[PDB]
Amino acid sequence: LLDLIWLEAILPKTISLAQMKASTLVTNQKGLIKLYFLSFLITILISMILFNFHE
Amino acid sequence: ASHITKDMLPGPYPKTPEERAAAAKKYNMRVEDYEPYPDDGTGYGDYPKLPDRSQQERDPWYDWDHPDLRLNWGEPMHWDLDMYIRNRVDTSPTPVNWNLMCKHLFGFVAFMLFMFWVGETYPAYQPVGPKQYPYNNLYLE
Amino acid sequence: SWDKDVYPEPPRRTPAPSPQTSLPNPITYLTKAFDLLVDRPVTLVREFIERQHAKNKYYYYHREFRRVPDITECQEKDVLCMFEAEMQWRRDYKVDQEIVNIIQERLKACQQREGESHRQNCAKELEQFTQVVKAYQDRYHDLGAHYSARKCLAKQKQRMLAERKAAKEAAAA
Amino acid sequence: MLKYIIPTIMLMPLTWLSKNNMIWVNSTAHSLLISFTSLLLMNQFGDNSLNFSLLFFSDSLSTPLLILTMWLLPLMLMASQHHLSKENLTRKKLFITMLISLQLFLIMTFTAMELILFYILFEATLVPTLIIITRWGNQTERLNAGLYFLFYTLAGSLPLLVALIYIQNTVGSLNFLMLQYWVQPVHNSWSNVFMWLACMMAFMVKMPLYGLHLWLPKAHVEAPIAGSMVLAAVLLKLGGYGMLRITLILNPMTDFMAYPFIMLSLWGMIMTSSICLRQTDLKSLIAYSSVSHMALVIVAILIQTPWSYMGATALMIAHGLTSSMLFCLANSNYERIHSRTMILARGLQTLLPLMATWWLLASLTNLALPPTINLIGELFVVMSTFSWSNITIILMGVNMVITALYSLYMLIMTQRGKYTYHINNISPSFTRENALMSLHILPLLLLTLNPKIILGPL
Amino acid sequence: LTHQQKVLRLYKRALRHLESWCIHRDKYRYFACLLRARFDEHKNEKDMVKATQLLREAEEEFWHGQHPQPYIFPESPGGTSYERYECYKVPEWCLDDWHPSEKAMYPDYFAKREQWKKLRRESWEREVKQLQEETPVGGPRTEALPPARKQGDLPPLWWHIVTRPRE
Amino acid sequence: TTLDPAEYDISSETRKAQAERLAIRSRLKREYQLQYYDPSRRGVIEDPALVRWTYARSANIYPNFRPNTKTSLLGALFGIGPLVFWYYVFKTDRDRKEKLIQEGKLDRTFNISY
């Protein structure tokens, strides 16, 4: 009730934590060649505003 | 190797009559006081729908038991309810609790008030005045 | 054997006689018979080996070491001279274990030889032994650096605290 | 090691080079012959110290620990042949070669001359163990247990490399333990916590605390043919000893934060043995005994100042021989009844009388009956942590209480009768079944005569 | 448990727990019909609560004052030296593997061993044939026909027919 | 004292048609005895009452488990609970024990061990 629960709850949470976020990065990369390139432009502008990159 | 009804599932209200017995004959027709409803206290992962726990208990004492193996030596077919505390635990006694055992040591707890005094043999009591005077009086002479 | 100054005992001082009666004593029946039954298979065999072992001899020597360097040598980044100063040092701690073993057996010597009084007599052991063990854990026992045995990296520095703290900082000694 | 590795690699092109079924007798013959040569140059003297040859050996001078590593390849081949002999000879030649390939790296480990030679050999294992876990088991929960055996051992051991390379370019070079004469102390800071903590935590993942023991009843429960790497995995757990090489020096003065490792591993000791008395899997019963009185060394290393190293060394090879044999008692008596359920094996002690002594003289070493190698080990630990604080006799005393009721519960389950079933279970414990069950107690009670061989520096 | 034999299982122990309470022999025996006299009050009447008050008030004065560590008949479910004969315990049919020169002894017992097994090895063409017929579907207790209508072999053959003798 | 244990009660005629619960166990015993007697078995019977006893106790607690309650979050009163208390004791010793060891003496002259 403890040795198989609250030691097994915290670290095999990490198995179910990364695979929750390994699904948001193939199923939102669903094609959309229109939407590759709208997202390259956000990356190219945010390098101008953010930090050291022009300095 | 048996896969159909291998063990329980997340119950205990998944149409309880289908559980005992598809296999695991804890109840006959889900009214046997052992239908697999007994998930006593949901939220604990222990004992799901579970042809299992809070069933009647306290001790297969392996008495006369003449059907066959019946009890604990001779192994009947499907009667395991909860174990590993029941190959060494038995039935009801004569009387009831009346905890006279703490009252038995209470007699010396009253005689701890006799630990305050001493046990000098000579003389007796003489407990009313200062004539007793435990130690000696004057000097040489 | 050994030398008796290391392992002392008083003489024997063993009373004797005292019969005084014609009552039947079994002591004349006991020692006057059984001593001969063991005298044949022991003394004749031990002497038989004693010439057979004196047929040839074998040799083993005293092993005395060389002590040129001692303590405060050498400079910090050296390895070689600070290896010899630990080979010096560890032999000066296995030996100083066993000198406590000798004096403790000296305490075992008196007490089974007197037994009855054992406290007011022999006059020496409880004075000698507690002036040696009280001279043990100070400066010769890294308490509590005893785990790594800390040869010259801490064996001097109890004794630095026995100089930098002691004898000047007592205010005013 | 001049050449102990050099003959034991020559064992490897002998197995495949051989004929048919002669491959069992050819390997076990020559493998016993190293046990003379292993003893031979080693056990020399002895007073500061035996640096052995070169950058490859400090001879495992004050901690012998290595003769026991060389019994086992001629102990496991006689054990593994029970249910292995149905596969192909091409895979039967494999399972002997990777087992030798596990003994190769352990031989350059424990000696290792360095701290960075240690790690790359500390991690040179876990590839030939994992092959014995995944292939050659039984039914499933092998594969997740093959992954729980990783990712604890490997997640912890990578911050060693960050700290050991950090020392190699900070203070000289770590390459020798005898260039560790110049050691600067490690004070109380906010970076020197992590230098202590990352260098320590990768050893805790193998010899477990009460936390992070979650992989230990996974690999031992679901386990190869007849304890065949389970005998190896009990040595490998106590082959994470290197905390004795590190923490004696190399941050010597941090006891300030020992306390979350003391109390976690001193209260966990009294509980993780208590949590096993209701086990129903027999090989998982032993698997928690291996948790408890292994974790007594973790409060014996962090507490320094010997009369503990007298005992903490003797406890590493206390149950090196005991817990090996208990697995061999359970790798046997499973070939006959095909379950590891402890309920089912009743009706015994009449059918197999000759192995009743092998149960007891196993379980009489946990009760430990003081003239053995066991209560010369615990009673130095007891008299050590008494001098830490007096109150520690309570928890460690109740440790002695519950394991008395624990060991007999495995004995007394066989003293019953009438057996109810079992037209099988005929085999009356054949000549092999007693031979590999012997050579355990035969050195175990022998060394109790002069156990000065089993001692640290100290 | 029928109401007919409900008093009877209490009647056997009503005198049995009494004799552990006496000290003489006649002290029990003078109380014999005296204990029977209260039991002979309600002789012949109905089976309802009209007569269940013999039993519904027999909880008091039987359970009240019930056998302060009574006599136990030492070969019983309880009591000392009941299941004690167990160092021998008769391990019947442990005679499978011998590697003989140990099968030299008892040449006639091993001769008679192979004779009795024909009833054991060959009874399944006859006993199991009617066993699907005599048992209709799932009925109560599984004793066969008590001669099995020609020759009872056994059905309990041979583990109940050649079982362990006590010594 | 653990327990009552309810060795006599009433009946007749509360639900008199409750019988043939023995028909379940007689069916099992007719299944078992026909299984147990045979001339060539050489091995145990499966008897999955044991199989459902281990596998519903070893596994099938964590796939069951949801932390929907606070009686499974009760374990912080039991897991980290006493481990808090053992730290509180052990730093009061080795500190009160420490100051007496430095400021003033307590042990005698013959304390080489330790």
Side-chain angles (χ1 to χ4, degrees), chain A residues 1-50 52-55, chain B residues 1 10-12 14 17 21-24 36 38 41-43 45 47-49 51 55 58 60-61 64 66-67 74 76-77 82-83 86 90-93 95-100 102 104 107-108 110 112 117-120 122-124 127 129-130 132 134-136 138 141, chain C residues 1-67 69 72 74 76 78-115 122-138 141 144-145 149 152-154 156-163 165-168 170-173, chain D residues 2 4-9 11-18 20-32 34-39 41 43 46 50 52-53 55 58 60 62-72 74-80 83-85 88-100 102-106 108-113 115-138 142-170 172-178 180-183 185-187 189-204 206-224 226-228 230-235 237-262 264-274 276-278 280 282-330 332-338 340-353 355-363 365-372 374-382 385-399 401-415 417 419-420 422-423 425-426 428-433 435 437-446 449 451-452 454-457, chain E residues 1 3 5 7-8 10-11 13-14 18-24 26-32 34 36-38 45 47-55 57-58 60 62-65 68 70-72 74 77-79 81 83 86-87 91-93 98 100-101 104-105 107 109-111 115-119 122-124 127 130 136 138-141 143-148 150-152 155-158 165 167, chain F residues 1 5-8 16-19 21-23 25-29 32-33 35-39 41-45 48-67 69-72 74-76 79-90 92-94 96-100 102 104-107 110-111 114:
Chain A
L1 191 146
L2 185 142
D3 297 335
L4 271 75
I5 300 301
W6 290 111
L7 296 179
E8 192 69 26
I10 65 98
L11 194 140
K13 178 66 167 62
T14 314
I15 299 171
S16 176
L17 194 148
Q19 293 178 358
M20 190 65 204
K21 290 186 176 71
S23 177
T24 182
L25 203 138
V26 181
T27 64
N28 286 324
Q29 206 75 34
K30 326 194 258 205
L32 270 58
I33 181 173
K34 174 166 74 172
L35 283 81
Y36 293 169
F37 289 93
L38 196 144
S39 181
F40 290 180
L41 181 141
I42 292 174
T43 305
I44 202 70
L45 62 87
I46 203 162
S47 182
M48 182 179 176
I49 302 168
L50 185 64
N52 200 7
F53 300 152
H54 277 287
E55 292 84 4
Chain B
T42 322
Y47 52 100
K49 62 181 290 183
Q55 295 179 358
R58 295 287 192 269
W61 14 228
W64 234 216
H66 280 70
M77 193 64 198
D82 198 359
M83 205 178 292
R86 296 288 188 268
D90 266 15
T91 196
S92 37
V96 101
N97 55 48
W98 290 98
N99 294 320
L100 191 61
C102 66
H104 190 80
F108 190 76
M112 188 178 72
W117 293 347
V118 296
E120 184 69 28
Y122 66 98
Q132 222 357 274
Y135 280 173
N136 324 320
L138 28 156
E141 191 95 25
Chain C
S1 66
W2 61 91
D3 290 332
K4 297 290 185 179
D5 55 356
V6 181
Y7 304 99
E9 71 271 15
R12 235 357 266 120
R13 326 308 238 50
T14 295
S18 205
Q20 197 180 3
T21 56
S22 66
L23 274 70
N25 46 1
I27 51 96
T28 63
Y29 291 159
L30 289 170
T31 182
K32 299 293 186 291
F34 189 78
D35 197 5
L36 279 75
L37 276 76
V38 184
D39 185 76
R40 298 289 184 184
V42 172
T43 307
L44 296 178
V45 175
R46 176 168 172 82
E47 193 272 332
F48 176 71
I49 300 170
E50 191 179 5
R51 294 181 292 113
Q52 189 65 259
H53 190 274
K55 184 173 175 65
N56 196 1
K57 301 295 182 69
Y58 290 94
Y59 288 158
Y60 68 103
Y61 288 163
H62 179 76
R63 298 180 68 250
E64 182 68 31
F65 289 103
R66 179 67 176 86
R67 305 291 187 183
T72 189
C74 186
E76 182 178 0
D78 283 326
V79 185
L80 301 176
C81 188
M82 290 307 295
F83 186 76
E84 289 174 351
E86 292 182 351
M87 302 308 109
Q88 178 73 46
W89 190 81
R90 191 176 298 273
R91 293 173 178 87
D92 289 333
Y93 186 71
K94 286 182 67 67
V95 169
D96 292 336
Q97 290 181 359
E98 301 186 1
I99 291 176
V100 187
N101 289 115
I102 291 172
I103 303 169
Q104 186 179 2
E105 291 176 351
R106 185 186 298 270
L107 179 57
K108 299 179 189 294
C110 167
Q111 187 169 358
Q112 285 297 319
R113 192 171 177 87
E114 287 182 352
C122 283
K124 291 179 183 178
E125 296 87 4
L126 194 144
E127 187 179 4
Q128 181 184 4
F129 178 74
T130 62
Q131 286 178 353
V132 172
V133 179
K134 191 174 75 70
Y136 180 79
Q137 76 260 13
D138 47 347
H141 177 70
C152 297
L153 294 179
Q156 291 173 354
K157 300 177 180 67
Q158 283 184 351
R159 307 187 181 193
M160 291 294 288
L161 288 178
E163 289 178 349
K165 175 65 176 66
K168 286 187 283 183
Chain D
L2 297 175
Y4 294 160
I5 55 172
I6 302 170
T8 191
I9 185 59
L11 296 175
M12 188 182 289
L14 190 152
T15 61
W16 52 71
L17 188 64
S18 297
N20 197 359
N21 202 4
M22 295 294 174
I23 61 171
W24 293 108
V25 68
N26 290 317
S27 65
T28 60
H30 299 284
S31 60
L32 287 169
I34 298 97
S35 296
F36 279 166
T37 66
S38 66
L39 180 62
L41 187 65
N43 289 318
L50 200 156
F52 185 77
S53 67
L55 281 73
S58 68
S60 181
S62 62
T63 61
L65 185 59
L66 185 63
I67 310 299
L68 186 146
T69 63
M70 305 174 78
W71 286 94
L72 294 177
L75 187 59
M76 295 181 290
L77 291 173
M78 62 187 71
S80 65
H83 184 274
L84 184 62
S85 66
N88 290 317
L89 54 85
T90 62
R91 290 184 291 172
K92 288 171 71 175
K93 291 177 176 66
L94 291 175
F95 183 77
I96 301 168
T97 53
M98 67 183 74
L99 189 151
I100 300 167
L102 193 149
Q103 184 177 1
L104 193 154
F105 297 103
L106 293 175
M108 292 301 292
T109 315
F110 297 101
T111 305
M113 192 62 203
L115 294 173
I116 194 64
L117 286 171
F118 180 73
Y119 178 73
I120 190 167
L121 292 171
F122 172 71
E123 190 66 28
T125 60
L126 307 174
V127 176
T129 66
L130 182 61
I131 299 168
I132 304 170
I133 299 299
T134 60
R135 283 182 289 178
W136 292 102
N138 290 318
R142 299 179 295 171
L143 293 171
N144 58 4
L147 294 174
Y148 285 105
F149 181 73
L150 292 174
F151 293 159
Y152 285 100
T153 309
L154 193 148
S157 65
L158 295 176
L160 290 177
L161 289 173
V162 182
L164 294 174
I165 281 88
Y166 181 75
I167 294 171
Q168 185 179 1
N169 55 7
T170 301
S173 68
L174 60 84
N175 297 116
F176 288 155
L177 282 77
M178 293 179 287
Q180 294 292 323
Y181 288 162
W182 60 88
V183 172
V186 174
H187 291 87
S189 297
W190 288 98
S191 65
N192 290 317
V193 179
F194 289 152
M195 181 177 175
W196 184 71
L197 184 61
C199 185
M200 190 66 73
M201 188 64 73
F203 295 154
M204 300 298 106
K206 289 180 72 69
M207 53 179 71
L209 297 178
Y210 180 69
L212 56 85
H213 75 281
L214 285 77
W215 65 272
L216 190 62
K218 300 295 191 292
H220 291 278
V221 174
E222 184 67 28
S228 64
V230 186
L231 301 181
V234 176
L235 186 149
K237 184 178 73 175
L238 60 90
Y241 78 108
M243 179 172 66
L244 282 173
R245 291 292 183 269
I246 293 176
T247 192
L248 186 63
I249 55 174
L250 191 63
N251 192 359
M253 61 175 288
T254 303
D255 189 74
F256 178 75
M257 63 187 74
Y259 294 162
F261 292 99
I262 301 300
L264 179 62
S265 63
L266 185 61
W267 182 73
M269 180 182 71
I270 203 169
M271 189 65 208
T272 191
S273 66
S274 299
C276 189
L277 282 76
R278 291 174 67 91
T280 61
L282 185 63
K283 289 179 71 68
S284 179
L285 188 68
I286 292 94
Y288 286 159
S289 67
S290 65
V291 179
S292 178
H293 60 277
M294 184 65 204
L296 182 60
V297 310
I298 300 170
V299 298
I301 304 303
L302 275 72
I303 297 170
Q304 299 299 322
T305 68
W307 280 279
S308 65
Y309 288 165
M310 297 295 175
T313 302
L315 286 175
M316 286 182 180
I317 60 173
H319 69 87
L321 295 172
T322 299
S323 179
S324 176
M325 176 175 63
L326 291 170
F327 278 146
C328 185
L329 287 170
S332 296
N333 199 3
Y334 177 74
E335 296 293 327
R336 302 177 186 177
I337 299 168
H338 292 170
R340 61 172 61 89
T341 301
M342 189 180 71
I343 299 298
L344 187 61
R346 289 180 289 111
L348 193 63
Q349 178 63 42
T350 64
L351 297 174
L352 278 70
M355 196 175 71
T357 299
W358 296 103
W359 290 107
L360 191 150
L361 275 70
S363 177
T365 59
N366 294 114
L367 297 175
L369 293 177
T372 58
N374 300 114
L375 282 174
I376 194 64
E378 295 179 355
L379 291 174
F380 290 160
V381 177
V382 171
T385 185
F386 187 81
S387 178
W388 180 254
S389 67
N390 301 115
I391 311 298
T392 62
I393 194 64
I394 301 167
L395 299 175
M396 180 177 64
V398 177
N399 191 4
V401 172
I402 300 169
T403 189
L405 281 73
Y406 175 73
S407 297
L408 274 70
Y409 177 72
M410 182 174 68
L411 294 174
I412 200 166
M413 194 66 202
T414 64
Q415 293 182 358
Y419 62 87
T420 309
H422 299 282
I423 300 169
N425 192 2
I426 297 170
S429 69
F430 291 104
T431 303
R432 183 179 64 86
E433 295 291 329
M437 194 65 70
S438 65
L439 291 172
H440 297 284
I441 64 168
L442 280 75
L444 182 62
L445 60 89
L446 182 63
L449 295 173
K452 185 63 182 293
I454 300 169
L455 187 149
Chain E
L1 192 146
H3 183 74
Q5 59 189 357
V7 185
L8 301 180
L10 192 146
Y11 180 70
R13 297 176 293 115
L18 178 60
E19 67 185 3
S20 67
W21 233 326
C22 69
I23 294 300
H24 284 286
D26 64 346
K27 183 75 175 294
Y28 175 74
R29 191 64 188 171
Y30 175 67
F31 293 170
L34 192 148
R36 184 68 177 86
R38 187 181 289 179
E45 62 189 4
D47 291 331
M48 296 299 170
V49 192
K50 184 72 167 66
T52 316
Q53 297 296 320
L54 187 148
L55 295 174
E57 292 292 327
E60 290 179 353
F62 178 70
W63 181 263
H64 182 68
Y71 181 70
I72 205 65
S81 294
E83 294 86 3
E86 190 64 30
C87 292
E92 283 182 347
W93 186 67
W98 288 106
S101 175
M105 296 186 289
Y109 185 77
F110 285 164
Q115 185 175 3
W116 288 88
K117 297 294 180 68
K118 278 82 176 175
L119 290 171
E122 182 63 31
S123 296
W124 293 100
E127 181 68 32
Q130 64 176 355
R141 193 178 299 275
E143 70 270 11
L145 297 176
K150 297 294 180 291
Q151 292 90 18
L157 190 63
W158 52 268
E167 71 272 16
Chain F
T1 306
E7 64 271 13
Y8 60 94
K16 189 175 281 189
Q18 191 59 41
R21 66 174 68 189
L22 299 175
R25 63 181 291 276
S26 179
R27 182 185 66 192
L28 295 172
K29 189 174 74 174
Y32 182 75
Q33 288 173 352
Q35 184 67 43
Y36 175 70
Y37 292 104
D38 48 355
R41 185 181 68 192
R42 191 180 177 272
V44 304
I45 308 168
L50 181 60
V51 179
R52 287 175 283 106
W53 179 248
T54 61
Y55 185 67
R57 188 174 183 176
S58 65
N60 291 317
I61 54 97
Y62 190 79
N64 190 13
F65 171 68
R66 58 184 184 271
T69 177
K70 300 295 287 185
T71 195
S72 297
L74 185 147
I80 203 166
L83 197 150
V84 168
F85 176 71
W86 293 109
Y87 180 71
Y88 177 73
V89 180
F90 284 155
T92 54
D93 288 332
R94 182 68 177 172
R96 181 178 63 85
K97 188 177 180 179
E98 182 70 26
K99 183 180 72 66
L100 294 172
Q102 294 179 356
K105 274 78 177 175
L106 49 86
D107 54 356
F110 57 95
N111 190 359
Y114 182 71

